[PDB]
Amino acid sequence: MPMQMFMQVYDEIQMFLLEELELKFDMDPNRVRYLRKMMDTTCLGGKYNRGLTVIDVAESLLSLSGARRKRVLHDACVCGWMIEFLQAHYLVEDDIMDPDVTVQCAINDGLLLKSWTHMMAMHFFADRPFLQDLLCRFNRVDYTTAVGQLYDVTSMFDFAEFTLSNYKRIVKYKTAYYTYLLPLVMGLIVSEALPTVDMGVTEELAMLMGEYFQVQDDVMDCFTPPERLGKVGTDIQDAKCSWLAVTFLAKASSAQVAEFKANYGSGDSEKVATVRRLYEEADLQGDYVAYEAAVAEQVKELIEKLRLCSPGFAASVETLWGKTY
């Protein structure tokens, strides 16, 4: 029922965007179908975890608080696609990083996906009292992500910044704000119950879940084979400030750090294997189970504090935590 409604509102949103281009932007049919195919390719095909979280929060604030019900759920679906289209916008920008007309189109597709989140918000929420507060919290989170990738892209340039605190800062702004905090806040906005929750505990829960999500991602990126991971892990080659790297530097010897510096950030097959050898011989995958266990305890505790004043809201955050845990 939730997924079936989410994909149904997608067709409704796609129809408005393409008809608006046809009727108000004088677009020919050939380009309308071109943009339909581009929209389906970039937005669909994922797990839609961020978009469905917006709906799961809204439905918990309805029965646990009807013409108001049908509006809030439909509003939660548009917000759910604002994030999915935003996630599509981020993925398209990543493909550009790694008169060529196809490079111009990829850049243009990235800016159309970001603009499409504003057009679907200005239309379906045109007469909602939260349209101004939604756009500002949405734009501030998008700004946050761009600041997050500046820390990530330049974490090796200016191994001084390879610390656990800077790692938290990178994960916090690049990932946690738009993947975990943004859908929860968006569910509270369409439910009109935003000031009914402790945002402090809410923001702290989102940062810890994003940190839990990124550490597990960094370990899989290094040890999970490509056919089981879904991609080719390139964190060691890209010289990324991963959790394995900053945890290794804290427990390595003086020589092992020198052997790490001489082999990290390279594309040679044996230098990468030498980095995995240092990771393996340092028992990092033993520390991984302990680090995440402490994070899960903090999440289990912080959900309870959010429950004394938000019982139903804590149920959806608990469901969102299970998808990450």
The annotation places the binding site for Mg(2+) at 94-95, 98, 152, 217, 221, 235
Q: Could you say whether residue 145 binds ligand JNE (CB under 6 A)?
A: yes
Candidates 50, 168, 172, 174; binder of ligand JNE (CB under 6 A) is 174
Beta carbon of residue 211, minimum distance to ligand JNE (angstroms, whole number): 15
Candidates 5, 7, 32, 119; binder of its own copies (CB under 8 A) is 119
Q: Could you say whether residue 101 binds its own copies (CB under 8 A)?
A: yes
Determine the longest span between alpha carbons in the chain, in angstroms: 68
**Residue 294 in tokens:** 């402490």
283: region left, alpha or beta (phi > 0 left; psi from -120 to 50 alpha): left
Pick 233 or 312: Cβ nearer ligand JNE: 233
Site for its own copies in 168-227 (CB under 8 A): 169, 173
Stretch that binds its own copies, among 58-66, 109-117, 245-253, 286-294 (CB under 8 A): 109-117
Structural element, H or E, at residue 113: helix 101-124
> What phi, psi does 186 have (nearest 5°)?
-65, -35
The answer to whether 125 and 132 are in contact (CB under 8 A) is: no
> What phi, psi does 107 have (nearest 5°)?
-65, -45
Beta carbon of residue 297, minimum distance to its own copies (angstroms, whole number): 25
Q: Could you say whether residue 105 binds ligand JNE (CB under 6 A)?
A: no
List the helix and strand counts (H, then E) for the chain: 15, 0
Determine the Cα–Cα distance for residues 273 and 270; give it in Å rounded to an integer.
5
Beta carbon of residue 132, minimum distance to ligand JNE (angstroms, whole number): 23
Candidates 196, 237, 298, 324; binder of its own copies (CB under 8 A) is 237
Which one of its own copies, ligand JNE, none is in contact with 174 (Cβ closer than 5 to 8 A by kind)? ligand JNE
- DSSP string covering 284-316, please? HHHHHHHHHHHHHHHHHHHHHHHHTT-HHHHHH
Q: Could you say whether residue 29 binds its own copies (CB under 8 A)?
A: no
Where does this chain bind ligand JNE (CB under 6 A)? 90-91, 93-94, 111, 145-146, 149, 174
